[PDB]
Amino acid sequence: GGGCTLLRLSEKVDVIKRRMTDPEQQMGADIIKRALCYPIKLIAQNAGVNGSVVMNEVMKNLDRPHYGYNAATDSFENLMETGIIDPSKVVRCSMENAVSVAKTFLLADVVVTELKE
Amino acid sequence: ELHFNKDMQALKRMQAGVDKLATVVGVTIGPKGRNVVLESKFGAPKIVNDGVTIAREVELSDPVENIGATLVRQAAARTNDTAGDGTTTATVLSAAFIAEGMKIVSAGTNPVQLVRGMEKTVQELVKELRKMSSVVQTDKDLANVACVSAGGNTDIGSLISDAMAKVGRTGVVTMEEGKTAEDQLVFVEGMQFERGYTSPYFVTDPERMICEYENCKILLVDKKISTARDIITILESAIRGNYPLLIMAEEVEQEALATLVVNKLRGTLKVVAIKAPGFGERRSSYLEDIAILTGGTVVRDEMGVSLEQATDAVLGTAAKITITKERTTVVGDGSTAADVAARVKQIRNLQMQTDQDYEREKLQERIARLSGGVAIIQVGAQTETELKEKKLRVEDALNATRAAVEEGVVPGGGCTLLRLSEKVDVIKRRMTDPEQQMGADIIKRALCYPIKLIAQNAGVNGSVVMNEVMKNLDRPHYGYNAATDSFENLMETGIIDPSKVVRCSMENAVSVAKTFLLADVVVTELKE
Amino acid sequence: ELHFNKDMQALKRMQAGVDKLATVVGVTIGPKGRNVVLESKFGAPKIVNDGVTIAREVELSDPVENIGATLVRQAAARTNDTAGDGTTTATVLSAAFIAEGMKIVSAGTNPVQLVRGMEKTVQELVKELRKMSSVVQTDKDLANVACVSAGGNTDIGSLISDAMAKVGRTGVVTMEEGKTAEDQLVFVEGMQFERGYTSPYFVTDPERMICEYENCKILLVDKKISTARDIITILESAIRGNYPLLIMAEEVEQEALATLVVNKLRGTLKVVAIKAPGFGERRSSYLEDIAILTGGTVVRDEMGVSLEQATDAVLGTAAKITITKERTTVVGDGSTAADVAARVKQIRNLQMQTDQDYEREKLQERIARLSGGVAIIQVGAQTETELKEKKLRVEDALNATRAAVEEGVVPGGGCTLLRLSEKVDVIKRRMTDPEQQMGADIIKRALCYPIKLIAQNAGVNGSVVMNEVMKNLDRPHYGYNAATDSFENLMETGIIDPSKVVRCSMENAVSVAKTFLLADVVVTELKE
Amino acid sequence: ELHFNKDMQALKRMQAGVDKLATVVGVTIGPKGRNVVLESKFGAPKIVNDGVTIAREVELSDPVENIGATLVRQAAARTNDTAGDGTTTATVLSAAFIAEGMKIVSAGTNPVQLVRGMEKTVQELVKELRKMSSVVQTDKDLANVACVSAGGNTDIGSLISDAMAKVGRTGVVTMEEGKTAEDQLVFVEGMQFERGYTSPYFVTDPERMICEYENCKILLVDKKISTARDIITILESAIRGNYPLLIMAEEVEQEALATLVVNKLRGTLKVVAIKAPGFGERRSSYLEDIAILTGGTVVRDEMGVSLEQATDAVLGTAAKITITKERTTVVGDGSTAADVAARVKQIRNLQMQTDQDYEREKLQERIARLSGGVAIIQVGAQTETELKEKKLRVEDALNATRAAVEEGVVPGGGCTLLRLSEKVDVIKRRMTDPEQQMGADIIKRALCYPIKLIAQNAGVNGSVVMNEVMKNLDRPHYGYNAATDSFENLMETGIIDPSKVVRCSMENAVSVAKTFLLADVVVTELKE
């Protein structure tokens, strides 16, 4: 948990070369990358600490040994053994739905609305 | 249909509303307080000297600064209905923590570590406040405490003293006027509980907003009530004998509650609504404990009789009943006194065979209030405006004495807030981050505000008064009486505050200041 | 006709203007600095990468925030003409102290103890800066410093190295272009002083604003000058031979000064103004030290000849003279070199018979500059634009090398500000009042700003950069070069700053922040 | 008195102004270009089909978008005076780099790496353009290139062909009309230099802004001139004989220059001021190289005769002199032709004994221009409007032929931009950061703009045009002539552009786009 799983997910779109590798789809991949960076940034920031340095410490270190950052205690700790864990169902559903509404958002080009008079 | 308020200025907005509330209640505080004029609903205006009445009526225009002042009103009201006093102190301290809070926060300081510092500081200052407290253990010192806390002369405070000297602990003393000019002490079979009414619309006589009824029958069950036709038949029994009815069966749903308040608003049916004591098997063991005490059987389905009709056998009787916000009291009824003398025997038998721990203290708290009973006191009568003036004085006397004997006693005049303030300087916290230290200094400078406002609005500089007491030794009960304007010891003189008031107002003020500075976004429904 | 600006908000007004000045100069700083487009006075615009030019042109509409920005410009300009560089660093530091300062003052903190904490912190940080400094004592390490400090390749920086390896101390190296593509070193009879021009209107060629004249006569008297009729006869002596004239006789009053600038503006008379070196008997002993050095006599009334007609040998000759803001230099004249070799003998004579102390060092500072002379260097020429680009590169090279060897050298990139910032945490001051501690933390967070603005406007987060540098050992010259974006030691790589610049910009920034936060009331003339 | 513009929107303001300039110059481009109506200073309007006249006159109200458009005007003007043509191409490309640049920058992309990508991509494309270029080495193919580049028929372009076939390299061919209808080729003793006149106020006949004089004497010294009394005596020597005078002594200061332009504005004295060729000892070796050539001695103070008076012996003669922005040409004078034939012998002698390297090429560049001389051509005359129409057609012909033979030739129509644009897709840079790749793609989409605007304003979709040219093989000189609206090889048809124009307009466009996107803050002096 701690939204750190979104960083580990974001740092695996750099290895995704798609078909037919048109620059636009690559932009969308970079879009997902920078968008997954936001949640942990908001968590660390609104807690009271710079999120840029936290993101740097976790990412530069090995991403596999469950390295993470607990904002509740503010210290370098493994999220598993400490007790900060998130259900994968929540992460998956919130991620798919966010893209689903972003789909029907950016695709939009004309909006109508019934007015008062 | 929702308005948005964000950033740094949104906080300042409701802070101003808070500061405006603490401004009018601020000039209320002090022995030489000022008069606040209120525009009447219809007719001649009402002059106010109380901080409670002011906090009740204040509500501004701008919604953000309106919910800000109301957010402090919560702490003020909550402090009042849990300590009996200290609304003025709660508000001014609340705004003090907020003002000094916003002052430091504006320097880009982390709110989380600040509020953590405040929480721990006041918490240790509460632990320190218990050390500061002066305990009463003798009925004669209790007499001196009572008579002094009572307005003016002793005598009447000397009457309350022996009134509670009879019934040792667990209360509960109730007062009433009439009928002939003497001091009539009366002890009868009465009981109380720490539950409250269902709706604040049952208040018999404002502004006391306390529901009192004389010569009324009682009725109670354990299960939830929603059906009405059963009570309608009992309503016919309440019309059969034009008398009010008592009901306290845990949760009454919106249907029966609406029928109750409608039949009460017209005056056709005098009804009372309230909750059940305890939980689980305790409920069915508490209502049956008060059933026979009131001279009535139990209408539970466990045996079980529960139908449309209801006679005198299923409902007990109570001469007088007085219920308030968090308390419900019964007294006066001349029913089976042996029941009160036999149920206590059953508790002793159960406690003798009890191996558990929770059952020991539950039987201990039940044997307490049972044995304590109710004691009701009758006041004298000189003129028609005399006991009315007395009854109010003895009302404020009893509540003050109870609040004092409950948690202990501390030197009043707001000086106890100074002594508590000059002990945060030695507090080295963990992990001693600068932010938490700021919060400690915030508590320090905030505790300074009440005494300053007291002296200032009295007519003298508070800076010199604070300097005279602080530089002098804080231990020999040194203080400053604003009533006489002289250096005196607050204990021997007669200026004392109940420690319950100081603690509650302090904790609540930090409580609202916690959820005030922690806020960052405020929403509000708008007109259009 | 006078406007009154008071309270707390009047401070924030000029703070905004200060912050606006630091905003534009802020994006100027750093190796990956940004361009700032200036509107032309008439025609094609002018893009600027320097922080000096920007600070010259900035002046806001609102008077209060204009004089506030102008107040910072004072420290910026003063740093520029006392160190040679660091306008960008002085400004951002000045605003840093002001921003962080007012951030704390807003909490009602005592300004007096705050600025006291600032002054002492930076002063001990200057004493610490001298420890941080690296000293050059060998001409070969001086060669490596000079070449690296020079732009790009060495060769020319390797030429200035031996140029100052010849003239050991006291300077002073002066440069000039022409005529054939080689490296021509020339040592001749030249001298300089630490005085300046009378008026900034004498500047020959802006934006260098340095008055340079070739093949001109020089005139010196010790007393003050106010009369004109004597000068207009020398003007006739300056018209007889169409040549410029040099004058530095202490104080020239408004009358003669106005006549001088008027006759110079029309181009009829090429005149130069300036001031006198030393004081009292020193003046009459310094002007006669340069009179014969320029091949002229003294027109003092002590002997004394002083009439209307002045001739050829009452005024010395100087082949080339270059003067600036706080310096005045002469060079080139092929006069009595024996004088330069005989006056030094007279100084040694006075030195050995001297029993005093001040006379010993006055003779020592005079024998220094006299023996030092003025070595003029001639650069080569590939094309016509290459010689100009070189001349500018060697101009910035010489001024950088001089500013480096003068006060010592410190690691550049603004990283030395962090190493200094992480030494205030150990500073336990007297009497350690919290306010002075706030001032220390203010300096800390303020010294953090420059490196942040450099990294940020370069294109990378400054927080991570600060962390990586600070968490690592601060002693093995660890640093971060924004030009390459990589972990590197600032020394071996070639990113160095002169310690004189850091110190001057630091002290001045605190100096203006001193007179900024101490302010409480501001006045200003209005239009109507 | 200074305004402040910052953030992202400040960039878009001047970007709009740039977009407005490229809008009017945009409809100018193309064979089927449109007419731009200009309001006259006084009287009948002036229609313009040239992009040069438009770029001169355009200047908007809003200062920021004015200095933005002017910033592009600097690129267009600089391209014009360094290539001879391509103002329209420079502007549309400049705005292309800006538009496509800001289009990517708005995504928060690093400006530093972007412009770095732009610089390197276009620089390698310059190295690529030199590959795309076609070379001319035969006078007969030169004849075909010249006649085609010339408007319409050949004959006259076939005359310029043999005109330059005579004088091989180093130029320089000058033209003139009159007097009898034939083809008169004339070679005489003439010379030129790559220097320019002092002030643009000396222009004889606009809009050609080129100062031309007939039958005038010359005068040159090496030292700087500031005095005037010597000049006013030569003025008297220029008044006794009503003839203009030539002066080129390096730097003429503000005094003499002001006197010169004043005496010229009244028509009493026909003067001009020009700079010195070479540098140092070269100057004194170049002015005496043109002194005797013009039949005059040297007035240098190196020995050295220089006083008040001046006669015919100190000043040479010149039949005709034509000077422009960056060139100064003399021709026609019938002086010592033996001088031009003897100084070349002296150069060969010095060349034989020269051991250096720079002296060899300096003697080589002097022996070149000396041997090349200055061939002047005379055109025929049918009517009076035909000779002027010819003279204009041969003026643009000569300038086009020189620009084509100088840097080589490339297929015109802006199609060479596509061939250059479809070569950035193979450019893998270092360290191949995405930003530099964006800058490469920016260059690609920007090079697509000119050909698109050409086809569009002509009257055909540019999308299908780009498709046909690009999808086909880019090597067999495939192109699209908008004049005939048809598939055609740009070489064999007659639509060719000089490589110098394409290269210079491309480099300057990136240069101003460099100092455009790098900008982040813009300042501007306001009215009040």
Residue numbers in the entry:
A (entry chain H): 415 to 531
B (entry chain D), C (entry chain G), D (entry chain J): 4 to 531
What does the paper say about this structure?
Chloroplast chaperonin, consisting of multiple subunits, mediates folding of the highly abundant protein Rubisco with the assistance of co-chaperonins. Unlike homo-oligomeric GroEL and mitochondrial Hsp60, chloroplast chaperonin consists of multiple subunits, diverging into two distinct but related α and β types. Though the authentic chloroplast chaperonin consists of both subunit types in vivo, homo-oligomeric Cpn60β is functional in refolding model substrates with assistance from co-chaperonin in vitro. ATP hydrolysis drives the chaperonin allosteric cycle to assist substrate folding and promotes disassembly of chloroplast chaperonin.
The crystallization of functional hetero-oligomers of CPN60 did not succeed, whereas the crystallization of CPN60β1 homo-oligomers was achieved by the sandwich method. The crystals belong to space group P21, with 14 subunits per asymmetric unit. In our study, the first crystal structure of Chlamydomonas chloroplast chaperonin homo-oligomer (CPN60β1) was solved at 3.8 Å, and displayed a rigid body and structural features such as looser compaction, a larger central cavity, less contact sites, and an enlarged ATP binding pocket compared to GroEL. In overall architecture, CPN60β1 presents as a typical type I chaperonin, with a 7-fold symmetrical cylinder structure consisting of two stacked rings composed of seven subunits. Similar to GroEL subunits, each CPN60 subunit consists of an equatorial, intermediate, and apical domain. However, there are three features that distinguish the chloroplast chaperonin: (1) The central cavity of CPN60 is relatively large; analysis of helices H-I (aa residues 231–273, highlighted in Fig. 2b), which reside on the inner surface of the cavity and are involved in both binding polypeptides and interaction with co-chaperonin, revealed that the diameter of the central cavity of CPN60β1 oligomer is 6 Å larger than that of GroEL. (2) The structure of CPN60β1 is loosely compacted; a closer view revealed that the equatorial domain of CPN60β1 extends away from the central axis, with E1 (aa residues 2–136) and E2 (aa residues 410–525) domains rotating counterclockwise and clockwise, respectively, in comparison to the equatorial domain of GroEL, although the overall structures merged well. The number of amino acids involved in contacts in one CPN60β1 subunit is much less than that in one GroEL subunit, especially in the apical domain. (3) Finally, CPN60β1 resembles the allosteric intermediate state. The ATP binding pocket in CPN60β1 is wider, suggesting that adenosine may be more readily released. In CPN60β, positions 153 and 154 are occupied by glycine residues that have no side chains to aid closure of the ATP binding pocket upon co-chaperonin binding.
